[PDB]
Amino acid sequence: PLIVPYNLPLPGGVVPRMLITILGTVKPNANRIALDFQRGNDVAFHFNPRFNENNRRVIVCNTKLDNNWGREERQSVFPFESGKPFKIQVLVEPDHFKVAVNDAHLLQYNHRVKKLNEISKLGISGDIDLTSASYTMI
Numbered sequence: 001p002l003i004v005p006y007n008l009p010l011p012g013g014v015v016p017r018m019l020i021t022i023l024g025t026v027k028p029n030a031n032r033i034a035l036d037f038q039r040g041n042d043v044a045f046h047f048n049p050r051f052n053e054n055n056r057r058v059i060v061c062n063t064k065l066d067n068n069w070g071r072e073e074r075q076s077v078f079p080f081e082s083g084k085p086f087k088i089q090v091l092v093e094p095d096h097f098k099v100a101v102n103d104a105h106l107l108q109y110n111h112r113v114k115k116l117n118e119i120s121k122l123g124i125s126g127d128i129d130l131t132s133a134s135y136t137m138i
């Protein structure tokens with residue numbers, strides 16, 4: 001393992017056909033996980049599984065601009081389980097990030113931040129044991 005929080009540099013930012021893979025295990029009494037694709041202080045793409053928001057499991061996605069959170073996009077499809085190994089795959093496409101978990105499509109998130117080549121860090125945090133974080137071009 002690596003110990004969270006972990007920052008993965010994305011040198012020169014991201015580009016369509018770039019596949020980011022995050023392997024780890026959800027901790028047994030997990031409350032939250034976050035991935036933060038950052039352009040400086042802005043968060044181009046925040047991907048935030050919540051295990052107990054009002055006693056429901058929900059995925060919240062958003063963007064932070066000038067330290068202000070925007071409109072949330074929410075999904076009840078929730079593929080994570082406390083205590084289990086996971087794989088998150090974020091595929092950069094021309095108009096969106098595509099997310100699959102454990103080889104099943106989960107969601108798309110339209111690019112609000114347009115300068116993909118300045119989204120130069122991925123922060124990984126929350127209630128996981130982190131096994132690896134890496135990228136390849138498909």
Ligand SMILES: CO[C@@H]1[C@@H](n2cc(-c3ccc(Cl)c(F)c3F)nn2)[C@@H](O)[C@@H](CO)O[C@@H]1Cc1cc(C2(C)COC2)no1
Nearest residue numbers: 032033034046048060061062063069070071072125126127
């Ligand atoms: C309470 O702050 C959350 C955010 N958040 C989470 C974390 C975080 C930290 C550490 C770990 Cl380890 C982790 F896993 C984490 F997720 N940091 N920040 C973020 O999720 C955000 C997503 O919109 O919503 C909350 C903040 C929020 C929303 C709104 C609205 C007005 C509702 O519609 C927009 N305003 O403020």
